[model samples]
Target: SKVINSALELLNEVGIEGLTTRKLAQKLGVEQPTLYWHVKNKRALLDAMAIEMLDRSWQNFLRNNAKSMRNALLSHRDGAKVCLGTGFTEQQYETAENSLAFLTQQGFSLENALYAMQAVGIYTLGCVLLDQELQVAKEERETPTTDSMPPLVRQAVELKDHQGAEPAFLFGLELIIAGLEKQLKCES
Candidate 1:
């Protein structure tokens, strides 16, 4: 977990938007090349960090209780966040493939399985960004007291919470899987 710890320190300090390879290397007291060897690019490093965070938190939550794919998607923090625009790398694809295999074996169609995975990823990212916006707003020193701010400004500072990201993830996951079940007649 050392890599993750180091990543967290850097991420917290500079935030995902500001973190750079050089900055991470400096923080770790290592050369940029060394860091590069571990993570090829900033995006790769962030992707890894996000995965690492999920691994440590509630990873198996999906593989566990969900009777349908939808339940799986809704089980953790920013469940969709960790996925999003980061096209599944080889490793990411492998992870998703395994999960999809589970669904397929249970009777979900190939198309449904893929859609379920992507839906979870997209939903999680959208909600996570919303969560991030709320976080930034809360941290703003000159808190805007009015809701009439510009859309972009409100996006930056208007914060709200689903309060149950985990359940929300599960809800979406279940909904997708349930729909898949209707389509495929999956018994499990």
Candidate 2:
């Protein structure tokens, strides 16, 4: 449990790519082999981390699964990358079942409810990835030379008046939710 907690803290600090047994061991003041005793391998470590994120967000599942998941992933750096395509445990199963139940109660068929759940997961991950990319781009001071750039591209880059990623994420999420709602209406 201590190792898991330290692993999650390290993940937020160094991100998925930067996280390794060596670094985690260094962070915990233990040898690399000691981490192996707790996690078996990097994949296992990631799976555990993913589960921890889900567990943290489980309480909110009954209210809003998508938002809950989004919050969980965004709580840590490169968190979506860590959670993507990982194996499910009992906690994941319960959260999924609750989400599916919520959708079905809203009049969706079981299959469509599954699709909606998957869509929300994919949308959240994509949005988080794009958000991370935009953050990285924001931090860098360099821009393409105007001489080599197309006029339209240069104009787009120069006009830095756009809203940040959070609003964009909300807008996109609503659009997806609206589309799903429309699909439900069509079904009835």
Candidate 3:
């Protein structure tokens, strides 16, 4: 647990690209071999960190679960990148079971429930990645301008107006939920 905690703190400090077992060991004041006692490799350490980040909170149903996941991934630097493609742990399994049960209870077939959950998870990860990139761009004074872009793309980029990512996140989330609702009705 201490290793996982230090890894997460390191994630926040260095971003995913900068996080390595060697750096983690250095941060923890231990030799690289010491970290191997806790995690098998870099991928294992990332998986553990992803699980720890998601396990920080729990929500019972799909919408809340999706929102909680989005918040969790956004909490650390390059957190979404860290979580992407990392294998699930028991903590993630429990959340998946709960979400699947909730969706099945809502009248979805088991397969559909799984699909819905995957859709939400993938969307959240991608959205958070883009959000983080946009944030970094803004911070670096590299936000794209309207002059060299198509009008629609330019308008969309300018719409943010320094307001932050939550509104867009919520909008996309609602779209996903509404699509699911439509699917539910069609299935009925």
Candidate 4:
């Protein structure tokens, strides 16, 4: 846990590409070998930290899975990259079990539940990663208003401007939920 926390701090300082074992060791006042004993390598370290982030956000995730995961990932620098490469950990079994159960309890069959989870996961990751890239490159456009953008791309163009992308996200999320409910109706 200490290692993971220290690594997250280091991540903010160094970004993903620069997060190295030696760097983490130096930050934690330990040698690389000591840190490696637990973390194994950068890959393992990323997995640990990703799982830690997810677990810390577990309660929120249960209450609002997509939005919670989105916020949790965005809170950490290069967080989408970390989570993208993550491997399942011990606690994930419990998460998977209960998450699936939760959806099934709501009338989602196991199959549809899996589809919903993956879709939300992919959507959240894609959105955050794209947002992260813009933030990282500082490439966010300087359009003061929609007037500057062509009318054709206006709605899509201003999509990323002003407010956070939550509107677009919630818009898309509703489509998925509405589609699922419609599916349930058809199944009955």
Candidate 5:
């Protein structure tokens, strides 16, 4: 937990690009070698921190609200942020597999389950990426909250709050699930 917290603090302060093994070590008041003992390299450490954050934030979200995948994805500051990109390790794959099992058990077909999972993943990424862009624009001047982008981008921009993230994710998810249901029904 200490390692995770420290890594998260550093990540927030410096952004993902600025996080480094040396900096993490210094911030944790441990030797770089000692830090290496826990994480092999900067990439490994980042992945570990990302997984740790996801475990703390999203895991419970998924478990408690397995029915509401959208809210589960939006439950944290950068829920989408940490999830996208990266060198996902074996543990992360296991997490994904576990989640897939949950969805399948809920009557989602394999294809539907994959799509649902992807929809949630991309939804979170879209929100985080949009938020990051907005934050950067605000650094220059307030980002326009209106039709300053395309339909989807505009939708993402307009839907600024976490509440919006939920329905936006669900709206797309419901459509995907509906389509899948139809296709699966034909097969059955």
Candidate 6:
């Protein structure tokens, strides 16, 4: 648990590429071999860290599980990359079972509930990926403006604040919820 917890902090400071088992050991005041005993390898350590992040996010699942995921993913640098393609720990299954049970009780067919959860999962991951990409680009390089832009989009781009990721995520979440509501209506 200590290794996983400290690993998350290292992820924020170092980003994904810079994260290493050696560095994690240094942060924990332990030798590399000792950590290897606990985590076995970098891949194993990342899996544990991903589960830790997800478990923290699930704390807010009684609220907006999707939104909670978005918040936790955005909290660290390259946070989406950490959780992406990672397997869950055994401890995560109860949350999954409870989540589906909640949706089923709320009128979602099992198949539809699974789809809805996956849809939100992809949406959140992609949103963070784009956000992290844009952040890196804005900091490290200059983006070229399109000269042949149409009037509407060009004009809208003038107010860059309108395109904030926070508001956009909320907007998309609401749309997804509305669609799910309609689906429930149809199924009923």
Each candidate structure's TM-score, on Cα atoms with residue i matched to residue i, is 0.64, 0.77, 0.85, 0.84, 0.67, 0.84
The lDDT of model 3 is 0.80
Q: Which lDDT values do the candidates have, in the order given?
A: 0.58, 0.76, 0.80, 0.78, 0.62, 0.77
| Structure candidate 6, residue pairs in collision | none
Q: Write the per-residue lDDT of candidate 3 for residues 1-188, one digit (tens) a residue.
A: 99888888887787777888889888889888877888888887877788888878112366787788888888888989888965356547776777777778778899998788888889889999898887778787864667989988877777776666888888888888888888888979
- C-alpha lDDT of candidate 4 relative to the true structure: 0.78
Superposed by TM-score, candidate 4 places the C-alpha of residue 179 at a distance from the truth, in angstroms, of 1.1
Stretches > 4 Å off in candidate 6 = 57-63, 87-89, 143-149
- Residue pairs in candidate 4 whose N, alpha carbon or C atoms collide under 3 angstroms: none
- Model 5, 1-188: lDDT tens digits are 58777887787688766778888989999888887778888767766666665565333434243344324334444445555664236757886777677767766577866665665466556755675566567789964656556788776655654465446545655565566558657865
Per residue, candidate 4 scores C-alpha lDDT tens digits across 1-188 of 89989999999988999999889999899887888788888888887888787778322343388887888898899888889834245546777778888878877789987887777787788888988887756656663576776887887666567667888777787777667667778987
Predicted model with the maximum lDDT: 3
Once fitted onto the true fold, the runs of candidate 5 whose alpha carbons sit more than 4 angstroms away are: 57-79, 85-88, 102-112, 141-167
Model 2, backbone clash pairs (residues 3+ apart or across chains), number? 0
What's model 2's overall lDDT?
0.76
In model 2, what is the error at residue 125, expressed in angstroms? 1.1
In candidate 6, residue 25 scores what lDDT?
92
Ranking of all predicted structures according to TM-score, beginning with the best and ending with the worst: 3, 6, 4, 2, 5, 1
TM-score winner between candidates 3 and 5: 3
Q: What does the lDDT come to for candidate 6?
A: 0.77
